Structures are given as C-alpha cells and as structure tokens.
Design a protein around this nucleic acid. Sequence first.
DNA 1: GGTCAGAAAATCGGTTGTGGTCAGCTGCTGCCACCGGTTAACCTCCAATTCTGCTGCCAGCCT
Length: 76
Amino acid sequence: QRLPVLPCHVGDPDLWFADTPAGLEVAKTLCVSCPIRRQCLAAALQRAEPWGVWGGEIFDQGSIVSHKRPRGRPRK
DNA sequence: GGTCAGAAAATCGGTTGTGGTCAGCTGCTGCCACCGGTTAACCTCCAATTCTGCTGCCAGCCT
Ligand code: SF4
C-alpha cells in the first residue's frame, strides 16, 4: 500500500526523539511530504502527547513549541 | 582585551501534597433460597431370514 511512502516509519524510529535541537530538525521537516499530516497532527493535539515529533511539529508535555531550546545560557 | 563569579536553560530525579479514587472488606441487615418435619373418618397385590451353537427331552439297548 502507501506504507513505504509514509515518512514516519521510513527509517530508524529512534531518530525522532533525539534530544538535540538540530538532530530532530530534519525529522520535523521530513514530514513536510507526509500525506497524513492533518489526522496525525489532530490525533497528537487531542490526546496530548508529551514527546517527540508529531505531525511535522515538536511537542512539549502539552503543547507545541516552535524550536526546542538548547542546553546552555539562552541568547540575550 | 582575556579570566572568573552569577544567571539562565533543560534534565534526571526526589519530595510532596493533597485530591480524589477505587476497592477491600466489614458489618449488617434484611431477605430469600433451601432443607427438614408434619397432616389421625375411611379405601391393603402391576402396563424377517439365515446360520450356529446349546440345552432339554424321550425312546431304547445294556447292565
Ligand atoms: S508525525 Fe508527521 S510524518 Fe510522522 S506519521 Fe505523523 S503525520 Fe506522518
């Protein structure tokens, strides 16, 4: 079916929870071409997923952050 | 025009705090399900054929 075209499970699944701001960036933008962004993002927002890339967007424990804040002192 | 204390990020983890929450009985209380005993005019005996082997039976020579 359309399973190998689905960009979620094409490669290694441990990529999409890597705890670097730059590592998961290609994981987030790899769901640009995903055919099911609407329903996946809708399910992720309704069930309140606390981790990882969902619907081509990252998640905190309840909501969506724009980009994950890096380790260290943030920029003034 | 470079080194050292403080501030500010998640991050892994302990506290903690209470706010319900669900169950675990626990009486307990009513009830309900189930088992056992009892009834004192009289009237006291049932509703097909084919083949093989076994046993019961009667005349009848033999002693
Ligand atoms: S997170 Fe995005 S890319 Fe991954 S399966 Fe869901 S919609 Fe597709």
